[PDB]
Amino acid sequence: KDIQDLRTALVRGYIDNVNNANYGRYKALVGAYDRRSLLDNRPGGVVEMERQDAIDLFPYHNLPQGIDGLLGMSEELKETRTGVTKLGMGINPDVFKNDNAYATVGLMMNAAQNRLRMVCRNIAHNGMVELMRGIYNLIRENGEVPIEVQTPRGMIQVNPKQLPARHNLQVVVAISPNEKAERAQKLISLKQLIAADAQLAPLFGLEQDRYMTAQIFELMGIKDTHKYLLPLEQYQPPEPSPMEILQLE
Protein backbone atom coordinates (compact mmCIF):
# COMPACT_ATOMS: atom_id res chain seq x y z
CA LYS A 1 0.00 0.00 0.00
CA ASP A 2 2.76 2.45 0.92
CA ILE A 3 4.31 1.85 -2.50
CA GLN A 4 0.97 1.96 -4.32
CA ASP A 5 -0.50 5.32 -3.32
CA LEU A 6 2.72 7.26 -3.92
CA ARG A 7 3.27 5.65 -7.32
CA THR A 8 -0.32 6.30 -8.37
CA ALA A 9 0.04 9.97 -7.46
CA LEU A 10 3.21 10.27 -9.51
CA VAL A 11 1.63 8.39 -12.41
CA ARG A 12 -1.38 10.70 -12.30
CA GLY A 13 0.95 13.68 -12.38
CA TYR A 14 2.83 12.20 -15.31
CA ILE A 15 -0.38 11.65 -17.25
CA ASP A 16 -1.49 15.27 -17.00
CA ASN A 17 2.04 16.45 -17.76
CA VAL A 18 1.51 14.73 -21.11
CA ASN A 19 -2.22 15.35 -21.52
CA ASN A 20 -1.92 19.13 -21.33
CA ALA A 21 1.15 18.99 -23.57
CA ASN A 22 -1.02 17.22 -26.15
CA TYR A 23 -3.21 20.31 -26.58
CA GLY A 24 -0.36 22.34 -28.06
CA ARG A 25 -2.17 25.67 -27.85
CA TYR A 26 -0.78 28.50 -29.98
CA LYS A 27 -0.40 31.93 -28.38
CA ALA A 28 -0.97 34.92 -30.64
CA LEU A 29 -1.39 38.68 -30.55
CA VAL A 30 -4.69 40.54 -30.93
CA GLY A 31 -4.44 42.49 -34.18
CA ALA A 32 -2.54 39.88 -36.22
CA TYR A 33 -4.80 36.83 -36.11
CA ASP A 34 -5.89 36.40 -39.74
CA ARG A 35 -8.69 34.17 -38.51
CA ARG A 36 -9.92 32.88 -41.88
CA SER A 37 -6.50 31.52 -42.84
CA LEU A 38 -5.41 30.52 -39.33
CA LEU A 39 -8.48 28.37 -38.63
CA ASP A 40 -8.05 26.51 -41.92
CA ASN A 41 -5.84 23.46 -41.38
CA ARG A 42 -5.16 22.75 -45.06
CA PRO A 43 -1.42 22.24 -45.76
CA GLY A 44 0.14 25.68 -46.13
CA GLY A 45 -1.50 29.05 -46.79
CA VAL A 46 -1.44 30.85 -43.43
CA VAL A 47 -1.21 34.62 -43.86
CA GLU A 48 1.04 35.50 -40.92
CA MET A 49 1.31 39.18 -41.75
CA GLU A 50 1.87 42.03 -39.27
CA ARG A 51 5.47 41.45 -38.13
CA GLN A 52 5.53 37.70 -38.98
CA ASP A 53 5.73 36.89 -35.24
CA ALA A 54 2.02 36.84 -34.38
CA ILE A 55 1.85 33.10 -33.56
CA ASP A 56 4.07 30.96 -31.35
CA LEU A 57 3.72 27.62 -29.62
CA PHE A 58 2.35 28.13 -26.12
CA PRO A 59 5.05 27.26 -23.55
CA TYR A 60 4.45 24.14 -21.46
CA HIS A 61 6.22 23.11 -18.27
CA ASN A 62 8.76 20.39 -18.96
CA LEU A 63 8.33 17.04 -17.25
CA PRO A 64 9.84 17.21 -13.74
CA GLN A 65 13.25 15.55 -13.62
CA GLY A 66 12.61 13.72 -10.34
CA ILE A 67 9.67 11.67 -11.61
CA ASP A 68 11.91 9.08 -13.27
CA GLY A 69 14.10 8.82 -10.18
CA LEU A 70 11.12 8.44 -7.86
CA LEU A 71 9.61 5.76 -10.10
CA GLY A 72 12.90 3.85 -10.17
CA MET A 73 13.26 4.10 -6.40
CA SER A 74 9.70 2.84 -5.93
CA GLU A 75 10.29 -0.07 -8.32
CA GLU A 76 13.51 -1.16 -6.63
CA LEU A 77 11.91 -0.76 -3.19
CA LYS A 78 9.04 -3.00 -4.27
CA GLU A 79 11.47 -5.56 -5.68
CA THR A 80 13.64 -5.69 -2.56
CA ARG A 81 10.85 -5.47 0.03
CA THR A 82 7.91 -7.34 -1.51
CA GLY A 83 10.16 -10.09 -2.87
CA VAL A 84 8.76 -10.22 -6.42
CA THR A 85 11.10 -9.62 -9.37
CA LYS A 86 10.03 -8.75 -12.90
CA LEU A 87 12.39 -11.29 -14.51
CA GLY A 88 13.33 -13.34 -11.44
CA MET A 89 12.94 -17.09 -11.13
CA GLY A 90 10.45 -18.90 -8.93
CA ILE A 91 11.14 -21.43 -6.19
CA ASN A 92 10.52 -25.08 -6.99
CA PRO A 93 9.78 -27.48 -4.11
CA ASP A 94 13.18 -29.11 -4.66
CA VAL A 95 15.03 -25.83 -4.14
CA PHE A 96 12.65 -24.98 -1.29
CA LYS A 97 13.71 -28.12 0.57
CA ASN A 98 17.39 -27.40 -0.18
CA ASP A 99 18.49 -24.12 -1.75
CA ASN A 100 21.78 -25.76 -2.79
CA ALA A 101 20.08 -28.33 -5.04
CA TYR A 102 20.85 -26.19 -8.12
CA ALA A 103 24.06 -24.77 -6.66
CA THR A 104 25.80 -25.47 -9.98
CA VAL A 105 23.93 -22.64 -11.73
CA GLY A 106 20.90 -21.54 -9.73
CA LEU A 107 22.45 -20.80 -6.35
CA MET A 108 19.30 -18.78 -5.54
CA MET A 109 21.13 -16.19 -3.45
CA ASN A 110 18.72 -13.46 -4.56
CA ALA A 111 17.42 -11.51 -1.58
CA ALA A 112 13.90 -11.46 -3.01
CA GLN A 113 13.99 -15.21 -3.61
CA ASN A 114 15.30 -15.81 -0.08
CA ARG A 115 12.53 -13.67 1.43
CA LEU A 116 9.89 -15.46 -0.65
CA ARG A 117 11.23 -18.86 0.41
CA MET A 118 11.28 -17.70 4.04
CA VAL A 119 7.63 -16.66 3.94
CA CYS A 120 6.72 -19.90 2.17
CA ARG A 121 8.53 -21.92 4.85
CA ASN A 122 6.74 -19.95 7.57
CA ILE A 123 3.40 -20.72 5.92
CA ALA A 124 4.31 -24.41 5.63
CA HIS A 125 5.44 -24.80 9.24
CA ASN A 126 2.58 -22.76 10.72
CA GLY A 127 -0.27 -24.05 8.57
CA MET A 128 0.45 -27.22 6.63
CA VAL A 129 1.94 -29.42 9.35
CA GLU A 130 -0.69 -28.28 11.85
CA LEU A 131 -3.47 -29.18 9.41
CA MET A 132 -1.95 -32.59 8.70
CA ARG A 133 -1.53 -33.34 12.40
CA GLY A 134 -5.11 -32.27 13.06
CA ILE A 135 -6.44 -34.51 10.30
CA TYR A 136 -4.33 -37.41 11.57
CA ASN A 137 -5.68 -36.95 15.10
CA LEU A 138 -9.25 -36.68 13.81
CA ILE A 139 -9.00 -39.90 11.81
CA ARG A 140 -7.02 -41.63 14.57
CA GLU A 141 -9.61 -40.71 17.24
CA ASN A 142 -12.71 -41.95 15.37
CA GLY A 143 -13.88 -43.87 12.34
CA GLU A 144 -13.50 -47.42 11.00
CA VAL A 145 -11.67 -47.50 7.66
CA PRO A 146 -10.00 -50.64 6.22
CA ILE A 147 -6.83 -50.89 4.12
CA GLU A 148 -6.13 -52.91 0.96
CA VAL A 149 -3.20 -55.10 2.00
CA GLN A 150 -1.44 -56.88 -0.86
CA THR A 151 -0.30 -60.06 0.90
CA PRO A 152 -3.83 -61.56 1.17
CA ARG A 153 -5.22 -59.51 -1.75
CA GLY A 154 -8.00 -58.34 0.55
CA MET A 155 -9.13 -55.67 3.02
CA ILE A 156 -7.89 -55.57 6.62
CA GLN A 157 -9.88 -53.45 9.08
CA VAL A 158 -7.12 -51.61 10.93
CA ASN A 159 -8.51 -49.97 14.05
CA PRO A 160 -7.85 -46.21 14.29
CA LYS A 161 -6.19 -46.63 17.68
CA GLN A 162 -3.67 -49.07 16.20
CA LEU A 163 -2.01 -46.19 14.34
CA PRO A 164 0.95 -44.59 16.15
CA ALA A 165 0.83 -41.24 17.89
CA ARG A 166 2.18 -38.01 16.42
CA HIS A 167 5.24 -38.30 18.68
CA ASN A 168 6.66 -41.03 16.42
CA LEU A 169 5.65 -39.55 13.04
CA GLN A 170 7.42 -36.83 11.06
CA VAL A 171 5.40 -34.84 8.52
CA VAL A 172 7.05 -33.50 5.35
CA VAL A 173 5.47 -31.14 2.82
CA ALA A 174 6.48 -29.54 -0.48
CA ILE A 175 7.57 -32.69 -2.32
CA SER A 176 8.58 -32.36 -5.96
CA PRO A 177 6.32 -34.09 -8.52
CA ASN A 178 9.23 -36.16 -9.86
CA GLU A 179 10.45 -37.24 -6.41
CA LYS A 180 8.88 -40.66 -6.97
CA ALA A 181 11.11 -41.22 -10.00
CA GLU A 182 14.08 -40.13 -7.90
CA ARG A 183 13.17 -42.74 -5.28
CA ALA A 184 13.17 -45.39 -8.01
CA GLN A 185 16.76 -44.51 -8.87
CA LYS A 186 17.77 -44.87 -5.23
CA LEU A 187 16.14 -48.30 -5.14
CA ILE A 188 18.08 -49.57 -8.14
CA SER A 189 21.22 -48.03 -6.68
CA LEU A 190 20.44 -49.80 -3.41
CA LYS A 191 19.86 -52.96 -5.43
CA GLN A 192 23.37 -52.71 -6.86
CA LEU A 193 24.71 -52.24 -3.34
CA ILE A 194 22.95 -55.36 -2.06
CA ALA A 195 24.02 -57.11 -5.26
CA ALA A 196 27.66 -56.27 -4.53
CA ASP A 197 27.80 -57.99 -1.13
CA ALA A 198 27.16 -61.74 -1.20
CA GLN A 199 27.03 -61.92 2.61
CA LEU A 200 23.46 -60.57 2.59
CA ALA A 201 22.41 -62.83 -0.30
CA PRO A 202 20.79 -65.49 1.95
CA LEU A 203 18.42 -62.91 3.42
CA PHE A 204 17.72 -61.25 0.05
CA GLY A 205 15.53 -64.04 -1.27
CA LEU A 206 13.36 -64.25 -4.35
CA GLU A 207 10.35 -62.67 -2.65
CA GLN A 208 12.29 -59.59 -1.54
CA ASP A 209 13.75 -59.10 -5.02
CA ARG A 210 10.30 -59.41 -6.59
CA TYR A 211 8.90 -56.92 -4.07
CA MET A 212 11.66 -54.42 -4.86
CA THR A 213 11.06 -54.80 -8.60
CA ALA A 214 7.32 -54.38 -8.06
CA GLN A 215 7.95 -51.20 -6.07
CA ILE A 216 10.14 -49.84 -8.88
CA PHE A 217 7.46 -50.66 -11.44
CA GLU A 218 4.72 -49.08 -9.32
CA LEU A 219 6.95 -46.00 -9.28
CA MET A 220 7.05 -46.12 -13.10
CA GLY A 221 5.35 -49.25 -14.49
CA ILE A 222 2.12 -49.25 -12.46
CA LYS A 223 1.04 -52.46 -14.21
CA ASP A 224 3.39 -55.45 -13.91
CA THR A 225 1.33 -58.64 -14.29
CA HIS A 226 0.38 -57.64 -17.85
CA LYS A 227 3.43 -59.46 -19.23
CA TYR A 228 5.97 -62.22 -18.50
CA LEU A 229 6.22 -61.07 -14.87
CA LEU A 230 4.44 -63.67 -12.76
CA PRO A 231 3.03 -63.13 -9.25
CA LEU A 232 4.87 -65.07 -6.57
CA GLU A 233 1.60 -66.72 -5.53
CA GLN A 234 1.30 -68.60 -8.83
CA TYR A 235 5.04 -69.28 -9.11
CA GLN A 236 6.23 -72.87 -8.82
CA PRO A 237 9.80 -74.19 -8.55
CA PRO A 238 11.40 -75.13 -11.88
CA GLU A 239 11.51 -78.80 -12.78
CA PRO A 240 15.07 -80.20 -12.56
CA SER A 241 16.70 -80.80 -15.92
CA PRO A 242 17.90 -84.28 -16.97
CA MET A 243 21.48 -83.03 -17.31
CA GLU A 244 21.96 -82.28 -13.61
CA ILE A 245 20.22 -85.52 -12.65
CA LEU A 246 22.54 -87.61 -14.82
CA GLN A 247 25.58 -85.68 -13.59
CA LEU A 248 24.59 -86.47 -10.00
CA GLU A 249 24.08 -90.11 -10.98
Binding site: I3, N19, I91, M128
Partner: protein
Protein backbone atom coordinates in the same frame (compact mmCIF):
# COMPACT_ATOMS: atom_id res chain seq x y z
CA UNK B 1 -9.93 10.29 -8.74
CA UNK B 2 -9.88 13.62 -6.94
CA UNK B 3 -11.42 15.41 -9.93
CA UNK B 4 -12.67 14.57 -13.41
CA UNK B 5 -9.90 16.57 -15.09
CA UNK B 6 -7.15 14.70 -13.25
CA UNK B 7 -8.26 11.29 -14.60
CA UNK B 8 -6.27 9.38 -12.00
CA UNK B 9 -4.85 6.07 -13.26
CA UNK B 10 -4.79 3.65 -10.33
CA UNK B 11 -1.59 1.59 -10.29
CA UNK B 12 -2.25 -2.12 -9.67
CA UNK B 13 0.80 -2.70 -7.48
CA UNK B 14 -0.76 -4.70 -4.63
CA UNK B 15 -2.44 -7.07 -7.09
CA UNK B 16 0.80 -7.66 -9.00
CA UNK B 17 2.81 -8.48 -5.88
CA UNK B 18 0.04 -10.67 -4.47
CA UNK B 19 -0.17 -12.69 -7.69
CA UNK B 20 3.62 -12.94 -7.96
CA UNK B 21 3.84 -14.38 -4.46
CA UNK B 22 0.80 -16.63 -4.84
CA UNK B 23 2.08 -18.25 -8.04
CA UNK B 24 5.26 -19.32 -6.25
CA UNK B 25 3.28 -20.41 -3.19
CA UNK B 26 1.10 -22.72 -5.28
CA UNK B 27 4.14 -23.89 -7.26
CA UNK B 28 5.76 -24.98 -3.99
CA UNK B 29 2.82 -26.69 -2.25
CA UNK B 30 0.26 -27.83 -4.83
CA UNK B 31 2.80 -28.59 -7.58
CA UNK B 32 3.56 -32.01 -6.12
CA UNK B 33 1.22 -34.88 -6.90
CA UNK B 34 0.87 -35.70 -3.19
CA UNK B 35 0.50 -33.15 -0.41
CA UNK B 36 2.49 -34.84 2.38
CA UNK B 37 4.01 -38.24 3.18
CA UNK B 38 4.39 -39.19 6.84
CA UNK B 39 7.71 -40.90 7.58
CA UNK B 40 7.97 -43.09 10.67
CA UNK B 41 11.02 -42.72 12.91
CA UNK B 42 11.02 -46.47 13.72
CA UNK B 43 10.83 -49.50 11.44
CA UNK B 44 8.18 -51.05 13.71
CA UNK B 45 5.52 -48.52 12.61
CA UNK B 46 6.90 -47.89 9.11
CA UNK B 47 4.03 -49.83 7.52
CA UNK B 48 1.40 -47.78 9.37
CA UNK B 49 2.96 -44.55 8.08
CA UNK B 50 2.22 -45.45 4.45
CA UNK B 51 -1.44 -46.20 5.20
CA UNK B 52 -1.86 -42.88 7.01
CA UNK B 53 -0.15 -41.04 4.15
CA UNK B 54 -2.46 -42.63 1.58
CA UNK B 55 -5.55 -41.93 3.69
CA UNK B 56 -4.70 -38.27 4.25
CA UNK B 57 -3.81 -37.72 0.60
CA UNK B 58 -7.06 -39.33 -0.56
CA UNK B 59 -9.08 -37.29 1.95
CA UNK B 60 -7.46 -33.97 1.03
CA UNK B 61 -6.53 -33.97 -2.65
CA UNK B 62 -9.18 -36.28 -4.13
CA UNK B 63 -12.07 -36.64 -1.68
CA UNK B 64 -12.12 -32.84 -1.27
CA UNK B 65 -11.11 -29.97 -3.57
CA UNK B 66 -7.68 -29.55 -2.01
CA UNK B 67 -6.38 -27.33 -4.80
CA UNK B 68 -9.30 -24.92 -4.49
CA UNK B 69 -8.97 -24.76 -0.70
CA UNK B 70 -5.23 -24.11 -0.88
CA UNK B 71 -5.62 -21.44 -3.57
CA UNK B 72 -8.40 -19.69 -1.65
CA UNK B 73 -6.35 -19.72 1.55
CA UNK B 74 -3.26 -18.40 -0.24
CA UNK B 75 -4.99 -15.56 -2.09
CA UNK B 76 -7.03 -14.43 0.91
CA UNK B 77 -4.32 -14.63 3.58
CA UNK B 78 -1.89 -12.43 1.66
CA UNK B 79 -4.42 -9.57 1.51
CA UNK B 80 -6.80 -10.31 4.40
CA UNK B 81 -3.84 -10.84 6.80
CA UNK B 82 -5.02 -14.37 7.70
CA UNK B 83 -6.80 -17.41 6.27
CA UNK B 84 -8.43 -20.30 8.11
CA UNK B 85 -9.09 -23.94 7.19
CA UNK B 86 -11.58 -26.13 9.07
CA UNK B 87 -12.00 -29.91 9.16
CA UNK B 88 -15.18 -31.53 10.48
CA UNK B 89 -16.65 -35.02 10.82
CA UNK B 90 -19.40 -34.82 8.22
CA UNK B 91 -22.23 -37.23 9.09
CA UNK B 92 -24.63 -36.83 6.18
CA UNK B 93 -27.36 -39.47 5.99
CA UNK B 94 -27.09 -44.93 3.90
CA UNK B 95 -25.31 -42.90 6.59
CA UNK B 96 -21.70 -42.06 5.76
CA UNK B 97 -18.87 -40.46 7.73
CA UNK B 98 -16.41 -38.15 5.97
CA UNK B 99 -13.59 -35.76 6.84
CA UNK B 100 -14.91 -32.55 5.31
CA UNK B 101 -12.23 -29.86 4.85
CA UNK B 102 -13.36 -26.35 3.94
CA UNK B 103 -11.82 -22.89 3.72
CA UNK B 104 -13.39 -20.41 6.15
CA UNK B 105 -13.03 -16.75 5.08
CA UNK B 106 -11.50 -14.52 7.73
CA UNK B 107 -14.70 -12.45 7.66
CA UNK B 108 -16.45 -15.18 9.69
CA UNK B 109 -13.90 -15.60 12.50
CA UNK B 110 -13.92 -14.01 15.96
CA UNK B 111 -11.19 -14.34 18.59
CA UNK B 112 -10.53 -12.66 21.93
CA UNK B 113 -7.84 -10.01 22.33
CA UNK B 114 -5.80 -11.92 24.93
CA UNK B 115 -5.16 -14.93 22.66
CA UNK B 116 -2.04 -15.26 20.52
CA UNK B 117 -2.56 -18.83 19.27
CA UNK B 118 -5.14 -21.60 19.20
CA UNK B 119 -3.35 -23.43 22.02
CA UNK B 120 -3.83 -20.58 24.51
CA UNK B 121 -7.02 -19.21 22.93
CA UNK B 122 -9.76 -18.80 25.53
CA UNK B 123 -12.63 -18.06 23.12
CA UNK B 124 -13.03 -18.77 19.40
CA UNK B 125 -16.32 -18.00 17.64
CA UNK B 126 -17.38 -18.71 14.07
CA UNK B 127 -20.58 -17.91 12.17
CA UNK B 128 -21.44 -20.77 9.81
CA UNK B 129 -24.19 -21.16 7.21
CA UNK B 130 -26.10 -24.40 7.84
CA UNK B 131 -29.34 -25.59 6.29
CA UNK B 132 -32.40 -25.89 8.51
CA UNK B 133 -32.28 -29.66 7.97
CA UNK B 134 -29.27 -29.97 10.29
CA UNK B 135 -30.95 -27.76 12.90
CA UNK B 136 -34.10 -29.90 12.81
CA UNK B 137 -31.86 -32.92 13.48
CA UNK B 138 -30.67 -31.36 16.76
CA UNK B 139 -33.37 -29.04 18.15
CA UNK B 140 -36.82 -27.46 17.87
CA UNK B 141 -38.27 -30.15 15.57
CA UNK B 142 -41.71 -28.50 15.70
CA UNK B 143 -40.40 -24.98 14.95
CA UNK B 144 -38.53 -24.16 11.73
CA UNK B 145 -39.58 -20.53 11.23
CA UNK B 146 -36.46 -19.18 13.00
CA UNK B 147 -35.33 -16.51 10.53
CA UNK B 148 -22.95 -6.65 9.61
CA UNK B 149 -19.26 -5.80 9.28
CA UNK B 150 -18.51 -9.25 7.86
CA UNK B 151 -21.18 -8.85 5.19
CA UNK B 152 -19.87 -5.44 4.13
CA UNK B 153 -16.29 -6.71 4.03
CA UNK B 154 -17.24 -9.72 1.91
CA UNK B 155 -19.29 -7.57 -0.46
CA UNK B 156 -16.34 -5.20 -0.87
CA UNK B 157 -14.04 -8.18 -1.47
CA UNK B 158 -15.70 -8.95 -4.82
CA UNK B 159 -18.60 -6.47 -5.33
CA UNK B 160 -20.45 -9.20 -7.28
CA UNK B 161 -21.89 -11.45 -4.54
CA UNK B 162 -23.62 -10.11 -1.42
CA UNK B 163 -23.70 -12.71 1.35
CA UNK B 164 -26.61 -10.99 3.12
CA UNK B 165 -28.86 -11.20 0.07
CA UNK B 166 -32.15 -12.94 -0.68
CA UNK B 167 -31.38 -15.96 -2.85
CA UNK B 168 -35.12 -16.50 -3.30
CA UNK B 169 -35.68 -19.76 -1.42
CA UNK B 170 -38.75 -19.61 0.81
CA UNK B 171 -37.95 -19.29 4.50
CA UNK B 172 -40.31 -22.13 5.43
CA UNK B 173 -38.29 -24.41 3.15
CA UNK B 174 -36.56 -27.18 5.09
CA UNK B 175 -33.34 -26.57 3.12
CA UNK B 176 -33.17 -22.83 3.83
CA UNK B 177 -29.75 -21.62 4.96
CA UNK B 178 -29.42 -20.10 8.43
CA UNK B 179 -26.57 -18.56 10.43
CA UNK B 180 -25.45 -20.69 13.38
CA UNK B 181 -22.67 -19.92 15.85
CA UNK B 182 -19.89 -22.32 16.86
CA UNK B 183 -18.05 -21.34 20.05
CA UNK B 184 -14.96 -23.04 21.45
CA UNK B 185 -14.79 -21.63 24.98
CA UNK B 186 -12.33 -22.41 27.78
CA UNK B 187 -14.52 -21.72 30.80
CA UNK B 188 -15.90 -23.45 33.86
CA UNK B 189 -19.54 -23.79 32.85
CA UNK B 190 -19.66 -26.40 35.62
Amino acid sequence: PVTAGSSSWVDRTVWESVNGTLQDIINVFCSGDEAVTFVADNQQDSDAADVATKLVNQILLRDNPGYNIISSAAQECLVTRNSFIKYYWDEQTQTVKRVKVEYVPSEQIFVDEHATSFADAQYFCHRVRRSKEDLVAMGFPKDEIEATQSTVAWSRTDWRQDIDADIGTDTEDIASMVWVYEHYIRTGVL
